[PDB]
Amino acid sequence: PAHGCRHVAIIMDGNGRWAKKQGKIRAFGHKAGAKSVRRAVSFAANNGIEALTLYAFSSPAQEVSALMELFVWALDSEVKSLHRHNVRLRIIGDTSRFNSRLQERIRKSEALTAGNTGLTLNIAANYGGRWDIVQGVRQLAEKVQQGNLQPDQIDEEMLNQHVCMHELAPVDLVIRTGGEHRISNFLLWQIAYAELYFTDVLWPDFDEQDFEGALNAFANRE
Amino acid sequence: GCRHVAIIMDGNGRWAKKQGKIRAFGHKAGAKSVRRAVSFAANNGIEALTLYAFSSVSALMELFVWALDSEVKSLHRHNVRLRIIGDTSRFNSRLQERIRKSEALTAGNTGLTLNIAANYGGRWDIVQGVRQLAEKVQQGNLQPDQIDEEMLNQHVCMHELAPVDLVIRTGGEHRISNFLLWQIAYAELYFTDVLWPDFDEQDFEGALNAFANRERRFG
Numbered sequence: 001p002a003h004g005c006r007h008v009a010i011i012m013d014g015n016g017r018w019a020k021k022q023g024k025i026r027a028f029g030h031k032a033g034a035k036s037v038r039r040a041v042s043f044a045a046n047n048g049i050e051a052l053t054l055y056a057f058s059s060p061a062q063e064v065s066a067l068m069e070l071f072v073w074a075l076d077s078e079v080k081s082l083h084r085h086n087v088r089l090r091i092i093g094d095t096s097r098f099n100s101r102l103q104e105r106i107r108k109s110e111a112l113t114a115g116n117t118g119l120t121l122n123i124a125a126n127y128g129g130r131w132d133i134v135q136g137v138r139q140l141a142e143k144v145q146q147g148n149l150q151p152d153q154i155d156e157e158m159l160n161q162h163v164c165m166h167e168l169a170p171v172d173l174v175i176r177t178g179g180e181h182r183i184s185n186f187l188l189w190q191i192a193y194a195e196l197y198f199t200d201v202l203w204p205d206f207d208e209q210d211f212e213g214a215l216n217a218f219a220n221r222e
Numbered sequence: 223g224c225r226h227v228a229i230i231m232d233g234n235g236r237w238a239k240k241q242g243k244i245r246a247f248g249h250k251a252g253a254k255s256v257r258r259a260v261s262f263a264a265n266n267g268i269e270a271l272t273l274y275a276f277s278s279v280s281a282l283m284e285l286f287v288w289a290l291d292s293e294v295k296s297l298h299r300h301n302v303r304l305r306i307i308g309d310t311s312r313f314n315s316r317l318q319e320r321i322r323k324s325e326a327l328t329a330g331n332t333g334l335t336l337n338i339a340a341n342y343g344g345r346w347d348i349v350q351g352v353r354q355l356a357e358k359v360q361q362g363n364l365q366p367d368q369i370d371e372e373m374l375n376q377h378v379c380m381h382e383l384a385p386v387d388l389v390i391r392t393g394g395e396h397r398i399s400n401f402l403l404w405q406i407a408y409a410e411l412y413f414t415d416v417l418w419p420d421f422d423e424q425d426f427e428g429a430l431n432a433f434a435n436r437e438r439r440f441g
């Protein structure tokens with residue numbers, strides 16, 4: 001609370017570059033990255049942060065189906081730990097085209113942790129900022145079609161109620177590791193007023209001290 | 223190849239205080255900085271320049287009228303196409319007409335398109351487009367699950383121009399402050415502590431250089 005930062009969003013990037021520098025393969029960077037993910041989640045939960053939203057940045061249509069398989073399979077194991085640390089898990093992104101199986105796992109993972117009182121962790125999977133806005137627009141569009149919503153009655157607050165994470169504290173700080181200075185279609189609507197923090201540190205090397213630096217930079221900025 | 227630059231001009235007031243002067247002084251200097259940035263963009267092949275004045279109200283409008291009346295003939299002469307983006311429905315009829323006439327007069331120019339955000343907000347921009355799509359739904363000429371990214375994109379401001387490539391924010395603050403949101407999904411973001419009145423050609427080129435290098439890297 002001292003940092004006054006309630007919601008932190010992170011574009012994780014640099015795992016491949018990190019591995020390359022050491023003459024190592026992708027698997028090595030991914031392994032290092034997952035470790036950094038756990039470290040960041042634990043840090044947030046132990047530092048009074050209300051919400052952490054993670055986005056794995058990566059530079060096909062057959063590959064995605066395979067990635068989400070890995071995603072969900074990895075999730076099933078992580079959920080136990082998350083639940084154990086009192087974390088509330090939520091998956092944001094277009095999960096509509098996921099097969100009903102791995103789509104039920106996600107659903108159960110969320111149901112299982114919904115009642116926790118610790119950190120709320122949002123993991124982006126097949127997520128897009130524009131997509132997020134659009135799916136929210138379709139919802140309002142349905143209500144227009146059903147006759148109980150006039151086009152001209154639509155305002156910002158209304159649309160805000162239909163975008164991902166509307167129930168949570170607004171995003172206060174966005175962190176992007178890896179050196180690139182862009183949002184890359186991650187959160188858009190939700191970062192209208194967020195502090196943007198760019199660091200050249202590669203995701204695998206981003207540790208607790210780096211996270212603290214970002215929070216300190218945030219606190220001193222206003 | 224930087225085609226569209228958007229700028230969050232900030233720091234006029236702070237600049238004034240640093241000089242131990244009144245706010246009005248910062249404004250005056252800020253105005254010169256605007257003329258300088260526009261000239262620089264128009265002289266270097268930039269396709270579009272979008273300006274947003276960040277602020278830490280009737281007279282405001284009279285100033286707008288005056289700026290339009292004194293600068294549009296020069297913009298037209300320089301082959302600059304002027305556009306005002308934002309909610310101008312609340313403006314008095316005189317200002318709205320000046321804006322409409324200014325755009326009409328320069329609409330046919332083929333040089334730099336200068337976009338001035340007036341009473342503009344990124345969320346408002348998106349919402350105004352959503353309301354346009356909601357109208358066609360109500361008319362039954364559009365299905366809810368028929369709305370997609372491409373469709374909404376065609377209804378947000380500047381959809382007819384090249385995509386925003388670079389967003390520059392002066393003044394030291396590291397936020398978008400509800401300026402462009404949908405349009406900056408893939409843009410390079412550049413923050414400088416330089417105060418707007420001090421932002422000159424060298425600072426602008428520096429951002430362009432940063433853009434070029436970062437394009438070679440990351441893609």
Ligand SMILES: O=P(O)(O)C(O)(Cc1cccc(-c2cccc(NS(=O)(=O)c3cccc(S(=O)(=O)Nc4cccc(-c5cccc(CC(O)(P(=O)(O)O)P(=O)(O)O)c5)c4)c3)c2)c1)P(=O)(O)O
Nearest residue numbers: 012013014015016027030033034037056057058059067071
């Ligand atoms: O852009 P990079 O270099 O930082 C990258 O490493 C991608 C990346 C960026 C930021 C974070 C992570 C990441 C890495 C490991 C774990 C986690 N935790 S997660 O909850 O966020 C998550 C877990 C499972 C999947 C996903 S994802 O589908 O949203 N992202 C993603 C994108 C690209 C590659 C991978 C990936 C992750 C782990 C393992 C693999 C597979 C293998 O590559 P590997 O065995 O060599 O490791 P492969 O089975 O084919 O041989 C691939 C994963 C995310 C996140 C991965 P890249 O070279 O793959 O594009």
